[PDB]
Design a protein around this ligand. Structure first.
Ligand SMILES: O=C(O)[C@@](O)(COP(=O)(O)O)[C@H](O)[C@H](O)COP(=O)(O)O
Ligand SMILES: O=C(O)[C@@](O)(COP(=O)(O)O)[C@H](O)[C@H](O)COP(=O)(O)O
Ligand SMILES: O=C(O)[C@@](O)(COP(=O)(O)O)[C@H](O)[C@H](O)COP(=O)(O)O
Lengths: 123, 441, 441, 133, 308, 123
């Protein structure tokens, strides 16, 4: 029986409870993404890595949900290597960043994929 | 004859009903179908008005090739019979007196086609799938729910302890039991307060947004909105309502309040099987599901496919699509008797509950896919190390069924292996399916 | 075992349920009855609470000597499960999940015994028989009602013409059809206004107090009370509600408003036969009638005995007494499975509708007696000289069935003769039963 | 082209506009009618949404046989552009910016066909002829 | 004063497409544009509440993006939340929730909304502290033909009196000096307390405004970065310069398209303060500022090709 | 394509997106100011350099808008050198200060100029 640690296990939603993804794993997720036709895009954040409620507390308002867009949505990306190149760009650009890959399903106008790609030290 | 008109060409602003009718002992389908139409519409000084403008028309008889006296009668009803925005008046006009008509033996309502000029008089979901995902920041994986048990009996501080524990483990939602309203052992406001405390604690801890369905069902319209108002006041994201015991009038009021105040509505189908179980009398659940998309809720209980045959599984997926999709074509295979255009009404996210266990994860991730809430009662809870690791158990199970699907692996086949290799890096998940190893592996 | 306790001695503050249960194919009554009890109550860390305090107990199995696998299981539920004053929570806790339990085939709720310590948490009728008679000044004769037809289709000025005509003839009430709410052909406020005009005209003319059931059923709680409020405003005596499509939450709100503002509530049982017709699955009407005495209404639709066998007629009179009486002893003959003490909750006057004709007057005056509303649709209306003399037709018919009863004559036998000698001094009544002379006399 | 679609089959839940349009001095009806449609509806990251779902379509050109440069362009607008019950938003979306478009000289709105699924979102007359009488 | 913005025209940004976008998406657009340097982002004149973006969700997601932008930049941000609605009641309901999130400006389409309703929204803004931005949707049904209708300066005057803090004045981009003068006639009627009769710029009557506050004018549509010196000289400091396609149309995305538009303007201002002449040195001003901003460089690369 | 840094680019409104001004640049702005007849005045701040909302969040309330007046409005300043002398005073007085020059147009009773003049380390 273990006690699940109350401290230091902050998650970043989808797939953040499996082991940290290998680049072949990253890649396959970016490939899936592309295989369904979803636009990749990168997002990143240097200071509020997790939801907070600074400006209002009414039902459903949270601050921290938006992150900064890293460059543009990669419209017509054809190989997932393009996406991965970008994560390696942002990490060297921003080693304090939290970086995540999102994917748009323009037609149903929903965002439909999300998973983190890089974290700062001790996260 | 007057109410059996095979002549009829249906208007685009007509509500069509497919009723399975079983006549008596010497009553031709033609009279059955026409009595159904007469009785869900009109009768006399139609020389002071016009019978023909407001009459329900039985315009088709099929024979259900299989059973005895079963037919499928198709009735068409004028849009002018219906009060805009009142599911209460849709059901009172269609199912209000025909099921007790002595010349039929049993009658079941199988489908209703709701024309776009009546769908637009209804608000529908206060928010729907796309907004809910947005509001909550949860994308690419079914949302996980957890039942707090026992049903009745527990105290407010206790319920909140349960809730915190379960939520910090990885589920995104915890649920007020369908019948904890306000009782001698847990009055509502205390529950709401202690659970608002547990859910913010969990969220602060995890970093993910949490919610607890606070059940606002009450014995009066007033007491119900009073409860909703205090959940609004603690800034908490979702309340819940038992739409069928509560009633359609009251749930359209709670749904309008949620729209106007920003709260998600989770619905529970308590009492449905008094209405929808017998296959020859009653109203089929996809008609009760349709009336909730129109009355309004963001989540609704769709049942489980665990231990359901592929024939069942297909009627289930027929009405899950009626709940999430804008256009659903007629497909008598899965019971979709009518094509349905939803003219952009938001979709209701479906909740799969009861009997669900960790090892059922790949089947539910493949049968329901990403837009659903998978609800473990006994899963979360029944785990032996306690419910926060039973939550981890259930959360890694699911994030492995998702990763795998994205890697191209097939969940129908590799299921038991998927979960098996993920048990290797999670004592939580290991512990969770130790007896299942014994039978299976 | 844990939920089948034949040991059990029922507490006076316990809600008992008599469920007719049909198990599967190899499930002993003992497990059926105990699953019923488990599922309308509890399951787990009852070492953090106590299972035993909140558990439903199956304390009796009978076998229905006649049918196949039918048993009558008696379940006992703690008063602490129930939210005071919420029929919504009574039904969600008892009938909310057991009827879909896979180990039973069908399940029907036959009776509920509602203990005095829960009856006192409910208001019940906003006024009840004694007050209503008082308020209206109508004593010693059943009250006569009239249906306005067609159901849908008619306009507000037209409906009011119908209403005036019928009321000045001698009926005391006229009825908004169960589904005229507010529609493209008759919006509510216009109807309410034109009928308030016709009903005061009729009253001014006759000298007797008149009423028209203005139907306040609406798609939201708010729109419903809005309608009630304007009937209050015209000073008119009764509004109506469809309690089962409206819902229990909403009707407890309309019943509290009527209590507080002086208006009688007439209830219509639309959709009941979706719930109460099949004899092996559902909820028996006397349980739906009991839940309306507790939720609140002053009149409710009890059905008709016209063309009912003496065996049927007795279950009908079992639940008419549950509606009007303070103490009803267990009498399994008429389906009264439990004795019921109503601890003075007011009684609901019963309404006999559909198929009723003038020549059925002596049977209904003897089967129902003085505390009832006898409701003629096609009687009033179907009369050939028009509906004010069809109202006279129906009013002399009844005042002769009453005079005769007071003179000692027997309505079961002399019926056809009673009405026959009264036809001699009323061309109205003569005309009314001319074809019946042809078959009978 | 993108906003001139003679291909188009109008949906029963579509608001159709018959605009009499007078183009400039060297602008073909086809561009006039398509500018009218573009401007009473949309423009860009329609790879984040979908242009095609929300675009106004100029689906017909007639020539008013009589006048100079007058044409009758028929534009079709999605029911999802319109806020239920708001004539204010019907007029802001149809007549809100096209009449000042420099490539037309004058523009007149001649008729609107209001589909039954939008007529039902409006109350209309508080009473109407029959009740009033 | 309220906003702490002094000595430079205020910069606005249009979110596009007009219809079609979702609430979370609109808010992403808004954050991106605002952190780049614009001070305002705009609910499209016809996003009210529709099947694809209901109002309250929009208002909430944009209140989140605009506070994020502000926290990041250190400058005060605003997003015109459009409160136009089909009834007076639904309109004030929207206003009330913007009041509730503490956000600085709502917007109204005064001519489709109507004068009765806009005097109600203007009184509510006065009483609750919110700026009102007005959009002149439907004006050209009324004011385009030169021989029938009502001239826009009469519709502008009726908005200063009905009430709004910002109003759409049009653009001078691609307007002849004769046009440009009727435009400047009514911009002055909007900002000034006394305007003398000057039939040249169409001011047929002298107008005393007896201290009624002035409406800041908004220059929209067709505006591009290289038009910055002309608009900074034709309109001067008391105006909002509104780029739709400017912010957005920039190829690296809209936060650097916002930087693009913000350095362009702060160079047209610096230069004016140094005595340089924007009518002449314009193209050179922007040219030397492109040298220290890849953002601004990228922003006017085709214009280099035609011009330089 | 560069990503505009999400961190460390806090602005101070007008002209704070051009390169940091040279004293000849400062001077010319103070000259403009004077050439139009606007009263110079200096303002400075040591701790809340940027708007915040501590005390109220209703529409339009922000804290941080007021700064401390450095000495007085220089009524009848005739050469911009007087103003510049002052900025050099305040910097030596206050090297943690943020210093800004504002200019009043007494007649239209609006403040009509603003631009920062000095910042603390690493701003
Ligand atoms: O609401 C639920 O969540 C159900 O009541 C499903 O009801 P429906 O028939 O009304 O859809 C649940 O089965 C149990 O309470 C949890 O089951 P478990 O412990 O096996 O996980
Ligand atoms: O409500 C009534 O009054 C019924 O609908 C009975 O319903 P229940 O099954 O719900 O009790 C009536 O039969 C007809 O509308 C009148 O019949 P008629 O013309 O023969 O007199
Ligand atoms: O309101 C605006 O901002 C306009 O609608 C001007 O309208 P008026 O005629 O009513 O004054 C705009 O031109 C576009 O939406 C943006 O143009 P762009 O992309 O070129 O920058």
């Amino acid at each position: 029986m273990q006690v699940w640690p109350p401290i230091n296990k902050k998650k970043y939603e989808t797939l953040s409870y499996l082991p940290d993804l290998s680049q072949e794993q990253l890649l396959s997720e970016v490939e899936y993404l592309l295989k369904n036709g979803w636009v990749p895009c990168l997002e990143f954040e240097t200071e509020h890595g997790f939801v907070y409620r600074e400006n209002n507390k009414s039902p459903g308002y949270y601050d921290g949900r938006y992150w900064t867009m890293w460059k543009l949505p990669m419209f017509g990306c054809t190989d997932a290597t393009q996406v991965l190149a970008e994560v390696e760009e942002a990490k060297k650009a921003y080693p304090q960043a939290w970086i995540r890959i999102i994917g748009f399903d323009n037609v149903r106008q929903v965002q439909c994929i999300s998973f983190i790609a890089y974290k700062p030290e001790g996260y | 004859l007057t109410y059996y008109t095979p002549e009829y060409q249906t208007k685009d602003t007509d509500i069509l009903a497919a009723f399975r009718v079983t006549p008596q002992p010497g009553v031709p389908p033609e009279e059955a179908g026409a009595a159904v139409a007469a009785e869900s519409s009109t009768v006399w000084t139609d020389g002071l008005t016009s019978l023909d403008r407001y009459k329900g028309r039985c315009y088709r008889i099929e024979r259900v090739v299989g059973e005895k006296d079963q037919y499928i009668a198709y009735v068409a009803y004028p849009l002018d019979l219906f009060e805009e925005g009142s599911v209460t008046n849709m059901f009172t006009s269609i199912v209000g007196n025909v099921f007790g008509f002595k010349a039929l033996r049993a009658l079941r309502l199988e489908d209703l086609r709701i024309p776009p000029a009546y769908v637009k008089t209804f608000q529908g979901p206060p928010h729907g799938i796309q907004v809910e995902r947005d509001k909550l920041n949860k994308y690419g994986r079914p949302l996980l729910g957890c039942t707090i048990k026992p049903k009745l009996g527990l105290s407010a501080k206790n319920y909140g302890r349960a809730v915190y524990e379960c939520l910090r483990g990885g589920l995104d939602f915890t649920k007020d039991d369908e019948n904890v309203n306000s009782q001698p052992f847990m009055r509502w406001r205390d529950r709401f307060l202690f659970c608002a405390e547990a859910l913010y604690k969990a969220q602060a801890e995890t970093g993910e947004i949490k919610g607890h369905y606070l059940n606002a069902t009450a014995g009066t319209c007033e007491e119900m909105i009073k409860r909703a108002v205090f959940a609004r006041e603690l800034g908490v994201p979702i309340v819940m309502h038992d739409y069928l015991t509560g009633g359609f009038t009251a749930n359209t009021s709670l749904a309008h309040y949620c729209r106007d105040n920003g709260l998600l509505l989770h619905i529970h189908r308590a009492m449905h099987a008094v209405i929808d179980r017998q296959k020859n009398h009653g109203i089929h659940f996809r008609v009760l599901a349709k009336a909730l998309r129109m009355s309004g809720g963001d989540h609704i209980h769709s049942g489980t496919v665990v231990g359901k045959l592929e024939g069942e599984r297909d009627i289930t997926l027929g009405f899950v699509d009626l709940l999430r999709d804008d256009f659903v074509e007629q497909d008598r295979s899965r019971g979709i008797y009518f094509t349905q255009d939803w003219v952009s009404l938001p979709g209701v996210l479906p909740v799969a509950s009861g009997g669900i266990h960790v090892w059922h994860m790949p089947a539910l991730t493949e049968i329901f896919g990403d837009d659903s809430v998978l609800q473990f009662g006994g899963g979360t809870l029944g785990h032996p190390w306690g419910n926060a690791p039973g939550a981890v158990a259930n959360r890694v199970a699911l994030e492995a069924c998702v990763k795998a699907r994205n890697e191209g692996r097939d969940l129908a086949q590799e299921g038991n292996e998927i979960i098996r290799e993920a048990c290797k890096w999670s004592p939580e998940l290991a512990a969770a399916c130790e007896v299942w190893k014994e039978i299976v592996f």
